[PDB]
PDB file of C-alpha atoms and ligand atoms in Angstrom:
ATOM      1  CA  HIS Z1159      79.635  75.915  96.027  1.00  0.00           C
ATOM      2  CA  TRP Z1160      80.766  77.047  99.512  1.00  0.00           C
ATOM      3  CA  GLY Z1161      78.601  75.446 102.777  1.00  0.00           C
ATOM      4  CA  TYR Z1162      79.484  74.100 106.151  1.00  0.00           C
ATOM      5  CA  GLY Z1163      78.938  70.694 104.843  1.00  0.00           C
ATOM      6  CA  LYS Z1164      81.990  67.688 104.872  1.00  0.00           C
ATOM      7  CA  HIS Z1165      82.477  68.284 101.277  1.00  0.00           C
ATOM      8  CA  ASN Z1166      82.264  72.086 100.983  1.00  0.00           C
ATOM      9  CA  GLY Z1167      83.043  73.646 105.037  1.00  0.00           C
ATOM     10  CA  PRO Z1168      85.464  75.794 105.637  1.00  0.00           C
ATOM     11  CA  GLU Z1169      88.790  73.621 104.925  1.00  0.00           C
ATOM     12  CA  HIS Z1170      87.930  73.237 101.331  1.00  0.00           C
ATOM     13  CA  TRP Z1171      87.067  77.339 101.270  1.00  0.00           C
ATOM     14  CA  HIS Z1172      90.607  78.234 100.507  1.00  0.00           C
ATOM     15  CA  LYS Z1173      90.580  76.224  96.611  1.00  0.00           C
ATOM     16  CA  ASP Z1174      88.339  79.007  95.300  1.00  0.00           C
ATOM     17  CA  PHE Z1175      88.928  81.754  98.171  1.00  0.00           C
ATOM     18  CA  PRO Z1176      92.933  81.419  98.979  1.00  0.00           C
ATOM     19  CA  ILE Z1177      93.151  84.436 101.314  1.00  0.00           C
ATOM     20  CA  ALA Z1178      91.577  82.081 103.597  1.00  0.00           C
ATOM     21  CA  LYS Z1179      94.749  81.512 104.472  1.00  0.00           C
ATOM     22  CA  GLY Z1180      96.008  84.686 105.175  1.00  0.00           C
ATOM     23  CA  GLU Z1181      97.483  87.150 107.771  1.00  0.00           C
ATOM     24  CA  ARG Z1182      94.017  88.497 109.326  1.00  0.00           C
ATOM     25  CA  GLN Z1183      91.659  86.288 109.019  1.00  0.00           C
ATOM     26  CA  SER Z1184      88.517  85.226 111.494  1.00  0.00           C
ATOM     27  CA  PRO Z1185      87.078  84.424 113.835  1.00  0.00           C
ATOM     28  CA  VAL Z1186      89.814  83.571 116.256  1.00  0.00           C
ATOM     29  CA  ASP Z1187      90.172  82.450 119.954  1.00  0.00           C
ATOM     30  CA  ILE Z1188      90.365  85.488 122.095  1.00  0.00           C
ATOM     31  CA  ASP Z1189      93.146  84.525 124.735  1.00  0.00           C
ATOM     32  CA  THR Z1190      91.572  86.816 127.638  1.00  0.00           C
ATOM     33  CA  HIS Z1191      94.783  86.737 129.554  1.00  0.00           C
ATOM     34  CA  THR Z1192      96.891  87.998 126.609  1.00  0.00           C
ATOM     35  CA  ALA Z1193      94.193  90.897 125.542  1.00  0.00           C
ATOM     36  CA  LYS Z1194      95.859  93.975 126.778  1.00  0.00           C
ATOM     37  CA  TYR Z1195      93.388  96.850 127.591  1.00  0.00           C
ATOM     38  CA  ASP Z1196      94.120  99.814 125.675  1.00  0.00           C
ATOM     39  CA  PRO Z1197      93.660 103.433 126.718  1.00  0.00           C
ATOM     40  CA  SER Z1198      93.966 105.155 123.524  1.00  0.00           C
ATOM     41  CA  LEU Z1199      90.377 103.557 122.610  1.00  0.00           C
ATOM     42  CA  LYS Z1200      88.000 106.089 122.595  1.00  0.00           C
ATOM     43  CA  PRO Z1201      84.254 105.653 124.462  1.00  0.00           C
ATOM     44  CA  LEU Z1202      82.343 103.329 121.874  1.00  0.00           C
ATOM     45  CA  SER Z1203      79.130 104.994 120.571  1.00  0.00           C
ATOM     46  CA  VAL Z1204      76.306 102.488 119.225  1.00  0.00           C
ATOM     47  CA  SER Z1205      73.454 104.797 118.094  1.00  0.00           C
ATOM     48  CA  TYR Z1206      70.316 102.791 117.150  1.00  0.00           C
ATOM     49  CA  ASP Z1207      68.055 105.248 117.991  1.00  0.00           C
ATOM     50  CA  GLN Z1208      66.726 105.712 114.383  1.00  0.00           C
ATOM     51  CA  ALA Z1209      67.441 102.296 112.859  1.00  0.00           C
ATOM     52  CA  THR Z1210      65.097 101.394 110.141  1.00  0.00           C
ATOM     53  CA  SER Z1211      65.081  97.414 109.491  1.00  0.00           C
ATOM     54  CA  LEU Z1212      63.322  96.462 105.795  1.00  0.00           C
ATOM     55  CA  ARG Z1213      62.947  92.921 105.567  1.00  0.00           C
ATOM     56  CA  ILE Z1214      64.404  89.227 107.374  1.00  0.00           C
ATOM     57  CA  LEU Z1215      66.041  87.084 104.553  1.00  0.00           C
ATOM     58  CA  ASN Z1216      67.108  83.557 104.336  1.00  0.00           C
ATOM     59  CA  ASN Z1217      70.016  83.383 102.100  1.00  0.00           C
ATOM     60  CA  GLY Z1218      70.947  79.699 102.557  1.00  0.00           C
ATOM     61  CA  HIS Z1219      73.820  80.186 104.655  1.00  0.00           C
ATOM     62  CA  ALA Z1220      72.222  82.231 107.643  1.00  0.00           C
ATOM     63  CA  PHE Z1221      69.416  84.893 107.783  1.00  0.00           C
ATOM     64  CA  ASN Z1222      69.968  88.368 107.804  1.00  0.00           C
ATOM     65  CA  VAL Z1223      67.966  91.001 109.133  1.00  0.00           C
ATOM     66  CA  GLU Z1224      68.465  94.116 106.317  1.00  0.00           C
ATOM     67  CA  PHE Z1225      68.081  97.973 106.986  1.00  0.00           C
ATOM     68  CA  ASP Z1226      67.501 100.946 105.062  1.00  0.00           C
ATOM     69  CA  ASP Z1227      71.097 102.178 105.425  1.00  0.00           C
ATOM     70  CA  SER Z1228      70.615 105.281 102.470  1.00  0.00           C
ATOM     71  CA  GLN Z1229      70.585 108.237 105.568  1.00  0.00           C
ATOM     72  CA  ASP Z1230      72.786 108.771 108.127  1.00  0.00           C
ATOM     73  CA  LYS Z1231      70.377 106.649 111.307  1.00  0.00           C
ATOM     74  CA  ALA Z1232      71.958 103.854 112.865  1.00  0.00           C
ATOM     75  CA  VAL Z1233      75.933 104.398 113.155  1.00  0.00           C
ATOM     76  CA  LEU Z1234      78.890 102.790 115.309  1.00  0.00           C
ATOM     77  CA  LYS Z1235      81.357 105.173 116.229  1.00  0.00           C
ATOM     78  CA  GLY Z1236      84.249 105.223 118.711  1.00  0.00           C
ATOM     79  CA  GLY Z1237      86.192 102.677 120.166  1.00  0.00           C
ATOM     80  CA  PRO Z1238      89.211 101.665 117.563  1.00  0.00           C
ATOM     81  CA  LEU Z1239      86.964 103.368 114.827  1.00  0.00           C
ATOM     82  CA  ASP Z1240      87.803 106.393 112.727  1.00  0.00           C
ATOM     83  CA  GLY Z1241      84.544 107.879 111.773  1.00  0.00           C
ATOM     84  CA  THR Z1242      81.353 106.598 111.278  1.00  0.00           C
ATOM     85  CA  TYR Z1243      80.149 103.222 110.471  1.00  0.00           C
ATOM     86  CA  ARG Z1244      76.585 102.478 109.190  1.00  0.00           C
ATOM     87  CA  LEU Z1245      74.272  99.754 109.880  1.00  0.00           C
ATOM     88  CA  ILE Z1246      73.497  97.736 106.768  1.00  0.00           C
ATOM     89  CA  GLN Z1247      72.116  93.796 108.398  1.00  0.00           C
ATOM     90  CA  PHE Z1248      72.615  91.527 111.187  1.00  0.00           C
ATOM     91  CA  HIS Z1249      72.554  87.805 111.203  1.00  0.00           C
ATOM     92  CA  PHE Z1250      73.618  85.013 113.748  1.00  0.00           C
ATOM     93  CA  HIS Z1251      75.518  82.141 113.604  1.00  0.00           C
ATOM     94  CA  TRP Z1252      74.530  78.709 115.670  1.00  0.00           C
ATOM     95  CA  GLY Z1253      75.078  75.475 116.965  1.00  0.00           C
ATOM     96  CA  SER Z1254      73.534  71.835 116.408  1.00  0.00           C
ATOM     97  CA  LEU Z1255      73.811  71.741 120.185  1.00  0.00           C
ATOM     98  CA  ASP Z1256      74.242  74.432 123.312  1.00  0.00           C
ATOM     99  CA  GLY Z1257      77.998  73.521 123.395  1.00  0.00           C
ATOM    100  CA  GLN Z1258      78.504  75.138 120.603  1.00  0.00           C
ATOM    101  CA  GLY Z1259      77.620  77.943 117.500  1.00  0.00           C
ATOM    102  CA  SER Z1260      79.987  80.690 118.142  1.00  0.00           C
ATOM    103  CA  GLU Z1261      82.555  81.789 115.448  1.00  0.00           C
ATOM    104  CA  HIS Z1262      84.545  83.754 118.099  1.00  0.00           C
ATOM    105  CA  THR Z1263      85.859  81.810 121.256  1.00  0.00           C
ATOM    106  CA  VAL Z1264      86.953  83.500 124.887  1.00  0.00           C
ATOM    107  CA  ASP Z1265      89.519  81.265 126.188  1.00  0.00           C
ATOM    108  CA  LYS Z1266      88.559  78.231 123.888  1.00  0.00           C
ATOM    109  CA  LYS Z1267      84.904  78.328 125.200  1.00  0.00           C
ATOM    110  CA  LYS Z1268      82.632  78.268 122.742  1.00  0.00           C
ATOM    111  CA  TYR Z1269      78.815  80.171 123.039  1.00  0.00           C
ATOM    112  CA  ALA Z1270      75.567  78.755 121.316  1.00  0.00           C
ATOM    113  CA  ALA Z1271      75.432  81.184 119.347  1.00  0.00           C
ATOM    114  CA  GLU Z1272      76.755  84.938 118.089  1.00  0.00           C
ATOM    115  CA  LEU Z1273      75.274  87.655 116.952  1.00  0.00           C
ATOM    116  CA  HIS Z1274      76.740  89.887 114.262  1.00  0.00           C
ATOM    117  CA  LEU Z1275      75.966  93.812 113.528  1.00  0.00           C
ATOM    118  CA  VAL Z1276      77.450  94.767 110.542  1.00  0.00           C
ATOM    119  CA  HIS Z1277      78.501  98.394 109.756  1.00  0.00           C
ATOM    120  CA  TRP Z1278      80.206 100.053 106.593  1.00  0.00           C
ATOM    121  CA  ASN Z1279      82.638 102.890 106.815  1.00  0.00           C
ATOM    122  CA  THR Z1280      80.687 106.056 104.997  1.00  0.00           C
ATOM    123  CA  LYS Z1281      84.263 107.434 104.135  1.00  0.00           C
ATOM    124  CA  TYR Z1282      83.755 104.540 100.946  1.00  0.00           C
ATOM    125  CA  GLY Z1283      80.021 105.925 100.003  1.00  0.00           C
ATOM    126  CA  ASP Z1284      78.283 102.108 100.072  1.00  0.00           C
ATOM    127  CA  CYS Z1285      78.878  98.789 101.649  1.00  0.00           C
ATOM    128  CA  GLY Z1286      80.004  97.101  98.099  1.00  0.00           C
ATOM    129  CA  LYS Z1287      83.111 100.025  97.912  1.00  0.00           C
ATOM    130  CA  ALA Z1288      83.777  99.573 101.879  1.00  0.00           C
ATOM    131  CA  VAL Z1289      84.360  95.771 101.801  1.00  0.00           C
ATOM    132  CA  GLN Z1290      87.099  96.233  99.257  1.00  0.00           C
ATOM    133  CA  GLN Z1291      89.435  98.919 102.087  1.00  0.00           C
ATOM    134  CA  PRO Z1292      91.713  97.402 104.905  1.00  0.00           C
ATOM    135  CA  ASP Z1293      89.223  99.557 107.515  1.00  0.00           C
ATOM    136  CA  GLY Z1294      85.787  99.027 105.857  1.00  0.00           C
ATOM    137  CA  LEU Z1295      83.714  97.132 107.465  1.00  0.00           C
ATOM    138  CA  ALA Z1296      83.186  97.124 111.423  1.00  0.00           C
ATOM    139  CA  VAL Z1297      81.538  93.996 112.925  1.00  0.00           C
ATOM    140  CA  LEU Z1298      80.232  94.068 116.459  1.00  0.00           C
ATOM    141  CA  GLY Z1299      79.861  90.489 117.533  1.00  0.00           C
ATOM    142  CA  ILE Z1300      77.780  89.639 120.700  1.00  0.00           C
ATOM    143  CA  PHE Z1301      77.895  86.055 122.144  1.00  0.00           C
ATOM    144  CA  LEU Z1302      74.647  84.185 122.753  1.00  0.00           C
ATOM    145  CA  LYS Z1303      74.772  81.763 125.701  1.00  0.00           C
ATOM    146  CA  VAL Z1304      71.239  79.481 126.852  1.00  0.00           C
ATOM    147  CA  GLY Z1305      69.209  80.148 129.842  1.00  0.00           C
ATOM    148  CA  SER Z1306      66.649  83.325 130.397  1.00  0.00           C
ATOM    149  CA  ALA Z1307      64.535  84.207 126.898  1.00  0.00           C
ATOM    150  CA  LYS Z1308      65.644  87.576 125.207  1.00  0.00           C
ATOM    151  CA  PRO Z1309      62.317  89.556 124.481  1.00  0.00           C
ATOM    152  CA  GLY Z1310      63.556  91.730 122.470  1.00  0.00           C
ATOM    153  CA  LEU Z1311      64.688  88.344 120.062  1.00  0.00           C
ATOM    154  CA  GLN Z1312      61.523  87.491 119.872  1.00  0.00           C
ATOM    155  CA  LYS Z1313      60.158  88.954 116.818  1.00  0.00           C
ATOM    156  CA  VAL Z1314      62.874  88.133 114.967  1.00  0.00           C
ATOM    157  CA  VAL Z1315      62.467  83.853 116.301  1.00  0.00           C
ATOM    158  CA  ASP Z1316      58.287  84.207 115.112  1.00  0.00           C
ATOM    159  CA  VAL Z1317      59.277  85.452 111.787  1.00  0.00           C
ATOM    160  CA  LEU Z1318      61.578  82.524 111.135  1.00  0.00           C
ATOM    161  CA  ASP Z1319      58.596  80.058 109.950  1.00  0.00           C
ATOM    162  CA  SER Z1320      57.895  82.509 107.532  1.00  0.00           C
ATOM    163  CA  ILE Z1321      61.396  82.235 105.592  1.00  0.00           C
ATOM    164  CA  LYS Z1322      62.482  78.370 106.759  1.00  0.00           C
ATOM    165  CA  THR Z1323      64.031  77.691 103.040  1.00  0.00           C
ATOM    166  CA  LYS Z1324      66.650  79.329 101.231  1.00  0.00           C
ATOM    167  CA  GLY Z1325      65.617  82.666  99.380  1.00  0.00           C
ATOM    168  CA  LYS Z1326      62.362  82.961 101.419  1.00  0.00           C
ATOM    169  CA  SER Z1327      61.894  86.705 102.960  1.00  0.00           C
ATOM    170  CA  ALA Z1328      59.458  88.578 104.661  1.00  0.00           C
ATOM    171  CA  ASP Z1329      58.426  92.330 105.405  1.00  0.00           C
ATOM    172  CA  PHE Z1330      60.657  93.011 108.620  1.00  0.00           C
ATOM    173  CA  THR Z1331      60.047  96.635 109.458  1.00  0.00           C
ATOM    174  CA  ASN Z1332      60.375  98.511 112.765  1.00  0.00           C
ATOM    175  CA  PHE Z1333      62.461  96.086 114.317  1.00  0.00           C
ATOM    176  CA  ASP Z1334      64.736  97.520 117.194  1.00  0.00           C
ATOM    177  CA  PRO Z1335      68.314  96.247 117.053  1.00  0.00           C
ATOM    178  CA  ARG Z1336      69.055  97.938 120.757  1.00  0.00           C
ATOM    179  CA  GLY Z1337      66.973  94.676 122.425  1.00  0.00           C
ATOM    180  CA  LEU Z1338      69.640  92.370 121.066  1.00  0.00           C
ATOM    181  CA  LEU Z1339      72.379  94.480 123.249  1.00  0.00           C
ATOM    182  CA  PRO Z1340      73.673  93.204 126.756  1.00  0.00           C
ATOM    183  CA  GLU Z1341      73.723  95.950 129.437  1.00  0.00           C
ATOM    184  CA  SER Z1342      77.920  96.377 129.425  1.00  0.00           C
ATOM    185  CA  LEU Z1343      79.439  97.735 126.103  1.00  0.00           C
ATOM    186  CA  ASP Z1344      83.278  95.799 127.637  1.00  0.00           C
ATOM    187  CA  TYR Z1345      85.182  94.408 124.507  1.00  0.00           C
ATOM    188  CA  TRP Z1346      87.824  93.449 123.414  1.00  0.00           C
ATOM    189  CA  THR Z1347      89.124  94.502 119.407  1.00  0.00           C
ATOM    190  CA  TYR Z1348      91.115  93.074 116.427  1.00  0.00           C
ATOM    191  CA  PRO Z1349      91.858  93.256 112.404  1.00  0.00           C
ATOM    192  CA  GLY Z1350      89.982  90.757 110.807  1.00  0.00           C
ATOM    193  CA  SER Z1351      88.113  89.345 107.796  1.00  0.00           C
ATOM    194  CA  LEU Z1352      84.492  88.429 106.917  1.00  0.00           C
ATOM    195  CA  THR Z1353      83.891  84.951 108.569  1.00  0.00           C
ATOM    196  CA  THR Z1354      82.339  83.585 105.133  1.00  0.00           C
ATOM    197  CA  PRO Z1355      83.733  83.580 101.760  1.00  0.00           C
ATOM    198  CA  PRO Z1356      85.053  85.454 100.434  1.00  0.00           C
ATOM    199  CA  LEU Z1357      87.117  86.114 103.343  1.00  0.00           C
ATOM    200  CA  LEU Z1358      88.182  89.513 102.756  1.00  0.00           C
ATOM    201  CA  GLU Z1359      90.479  91.347 105.498  1.00  0.00           C
ATOM    202  CA  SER Z1360      88.414  94.758 105.422  1.00  0.00           C
ATOM    203  CA  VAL Z1361      86.759  94.108 109.116  1.00  0.00           C
ATOM    204  CA  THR Z1362      87.125  95.526 112.674  1.00  0.00           C
ATOM    205  CA  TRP Z1363      85.999  93.348 114.927  1.00  0.00           C
ATOM    206  CA  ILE Z1364      84.134  94.244 117.921  1.00  0.00           C
ATOM    207  CA  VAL Z1365      83.229  91.532 120.080  1.00  0.00           C
ATOM    208  CA  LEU Z1366      81.300  92.257 123.331  1.00  0.00           C
ATOM    209  CA  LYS Z1367      82.494  90.663 126.700  1.00  0.00           C
ATOM    210  CA  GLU Z1368      79.151  89.912 127.943  1.00  0.00           C
ATOM    211  CA  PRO Z1369      77.017  87.914 126.212  1.00  0.00           C
ATOM    212  CA  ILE Z1370      73.354  87.854 125.941  1.00  0.00           C
ATOM    213  CA  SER Z1371      71.194  85.115 127.538  1.00  0.00           C
ATOM    214  CA  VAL Z1372      68.335  83.786 124.941  1.00  0.00           C
ATOM    215  CA  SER Z1373      65.972  80.650 125.654  1.00  0.00           C
ATOM    216  CA  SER Z1374      66.174  77.293 124.978  1.00  0.00           C
ATOM    217  CA  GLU Z1375      63.139  77.485 122.765  1.00  0.00           C
ATOM    218  CA  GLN Z1376      64.415  80.649 120.796  1.00  0.00           C
ATOM    219  CA  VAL Z1377      67.390  79.161 119.786  1.00  0.00           C
ATOM    220  CA  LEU Z1378      65.185  75.599 118.793  1.00  0.00           C
ATOM    221  CA  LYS Z1379      63.335  78.060 116.340  1.00  0.00           C
ATOM    222  CA  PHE Z1380      67.092  79.029 114.861  1.00  0.00           C
ATOM    223  CA  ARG Z1381      67.462  75.089 114.292  1.00  0.00           C
ATOM    224  CA  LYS Z1382      64.208  74.537 112.418  1.00  0.00           C
ATOM    225  CA  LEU Z1383      65.744  76.875 109.617  1.00  0.00           C
ATOM    226  CA  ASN Z1384      66.722  74.639 105.902  1.00  0.00           C
ATOM    227  CA  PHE Z1385      69.975  75.596 104.135  1.00  0.00           C
ATOM    228  CA  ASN Z1386      67.851  74.050 101.621  1.00  0.00           C
ATOM    229  CA  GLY Z1387      65.612  75.842  98.858  1.00  0.00           C
ATOM    230  CA  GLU Z1388      61.564  74.814  98.973  1.00  0.00           C
ATOM    231  CA  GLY Z1389      61.392  71.451  96.847  1.00  0.00           C
ATOM    232  CA  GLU Z1390      64.513  70.194  97.680  1.00  0.00           C
ATOM    233  CA  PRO Z1391      65.885  67.150 100.606  1.00  0.00           C
ATOM    234  CA  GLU Z1392      65.548  69.090 104.381  1.00  0.00           C
ATOM    235  CA  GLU Z1393      68.961  69.884 105.577  1.00  0.00           C
ATOM    236  CA  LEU Z1394      68.883  71.942 108.762  1.00  0.00           C
ATOM    237  CA  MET Z1395      70.191  74.882 109.047  1.00  0.00           C
ATOM    238  CA  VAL Z1396      72.808  74.329 112.420  1.00  0.00           C
ATOM    239  CA  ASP Z1397      76.969  74.749 112.933  1.00  0.00           C
ATOM    240  CA  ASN Z1398      76.489  77.613 110.523  1.00  0.00           C
ATOM    241  CA  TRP Z1399      80.255  78.726 112.283  1.00  0.00           C
ATOM    242  CA  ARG Z1400      83.848  78.840 110.967  1.00  0.00           C
ATOM    243  CA  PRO Z1401      85.986  77.942 113.392  1.00  0.00           C
ATOM    244  CA  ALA Z1402      88.790  80.339 115.271  1.00  0.00           C
ATOM    245  CA  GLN Z1403      91.894  80.786 112.884  1.00  0.00           C
ATOM    246  CA  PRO Z1404      95.340  81.477 113.465  1.00  0.00           C
ATOM    247  CA  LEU Z1405      96.213  84.824 115.132  1.00  0.00           C
ATOM    248  CA  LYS Z1406      99.656  85.130 113.161  1.00  0.00           C
ATOM    249  CA  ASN Z1407     100.921  88.742 113.427  1.00  0.00           C
ATOM    250  CA  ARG Z1408      97.711  90.572 115.768  1.00  0.00           C
ATOM    251  CA  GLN Z1409      97.253  91.647 118.895  1.00  0.00           C
ATOM    252  CA  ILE Z1410      93.418  91.622 120.518  1.00  0.00           C
ATOM    253  CA  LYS Z1411      92.623  94.965 122.821  1.00  0.00           C
ATOM    254  CA  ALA Z1412      90.761  95.320 125.662  1.00  0.00           C
ATOM    255  CA  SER Z1413      88.654  98.068 126.403  1.00  0.00           C
ATOM    256  CA  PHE Z1414      88.125  97.629 130.004  1.00  0.00           C
ATOM    257  CA  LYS Z1415      90.773  96.796 133.180  1.00  0.00           C
TER     258      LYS Z1415
HETATM  259  N1  75Y Q2372      80.105  87.448 109.312  1.00  0.00           N
HETATM  260  S1  75Y Q2372      80.763  87.995 109.061  1.00  0.00           S
HETATM  261  O1  75Y Q2372      81.869  88.277 108.847  1.00  0.00           O
HETATM  262  O2  75Y Q2372      79.757  89.041 110.152  1.00  0.00           O
HETATM  263  C1  75Y Q2372      80.150  88.837 107.181  1.00  0.00           C
HETATM  264  C2  75Y Q2372      79.593  90.362 107.246  1.00  0.00           C
HETATM  265  C3  75Y Q2372      79.013  90.544 106.353  1.00  0.00           C
HETATM  266  C4  75Y Q2372      79.205  90.070 104.607  1.00  0.00           C
HETATM  267  N2  75Y Q2372      78.792  89.788 103.874  1.00  0.00           N
HETATM  268  C5  75Y Q2372      77.328  91.242 103.466  1.00  0.00           C
HETATM  269  O3  75Y Q2372      76.728  91.771 104.541  1.00  0.00           O
HETATM  270  C6  75Y Q2372      77.049  91.087 101.629  1.00  0.00           C
HETATM  271  N3  75Y Q2372      76.039  92.052 102.179  1.00  0.00           N
HETATM  272  C7  75Y Q2372      76.294  93.294 101.754  1.00  0.00           C
HETATM  273  O4  75Y Q2372      77.297  93.789 101.108  1.00  0.00           O
HETATM  274  C8  75Y Q2372      75.300  94.198 101.605  1.00  0.00           C
HETATM  275  C9  75Y Q2372      74.353  93.236 102.147  1.00  0.00           C
HETATM  276  C10 75Y Q2372      74.725  92.299 102.012  1.00  0.00           C
HETATM  277  O5  75Y Q2372      74.522  91.318 102.632  1.00  0.00           O
HETATM  278  C11 75Y Q2372      79.447  88.327 104.683  1.00  0.00           C
HETATM  279  C12 75Y Q2372      80.042  88.204 106.232  1.00  0.00           C
HETATM  280 ZN1   ZN Q2373      78.505  86.713 110.595  1.00  0.00          ZN
END
């Protein structure tokens, strides 16, 4: 099955998922000089006050912090979005070294990691239906750089020892995702796709300009996770990022001057 290795990695995905070579694939390089300020963008609204986390899962590709999305609570609205998008999960992509790990790049700069907060358009009723629509999902992308520790990340870091291997999960209630946001909500936006198979072209990407800082010790604990299951040979969960894909007929818009 698909993964991030030499024999099952991003360069192989097109054989089982031909949309890998499509017209709106993600991630992309964000050319900051070409991106144009868009005055038609409305104010972005991230309303996570009532977010209700449930569980954390190692799925063999990353780990997901899952939310109860059965009521209208943690919502993303405004910016490029029409209507309301509900938070369902977040996860990260990261590197084996501090010099790589992000999926999006900024003037070809790779960050140490990238946080994806995944939301579905409530007009489609649930996330499984939403992902089949061109405006079905909105992913808020946040870059991570190595420096000062992120206090709001530490509860995630400390539970990772309990979900080391593929298929392990743990209770993860009362986690506040507001502790993972930077100060500024300045962003770039473009139409794209899931960055993992099935690579569906159903995502509005909103990538924040300001990275968050995490400590070397925090990211080192991400790198102790395993792609493999319990009782299988250890394959460290590192470099679980897809490289930048062709921009093709797309414009990246900036929320800021
Ligand atoms: N990397 S990314 O583009 O943000 C990316 C984002 C999302 C998914 N897939 C899912 O969320 C699958 N899923 C559901 O539909 C409901 C729960 C769940 O885990 C895959 C990739
Ligand atoms: Zn992702």
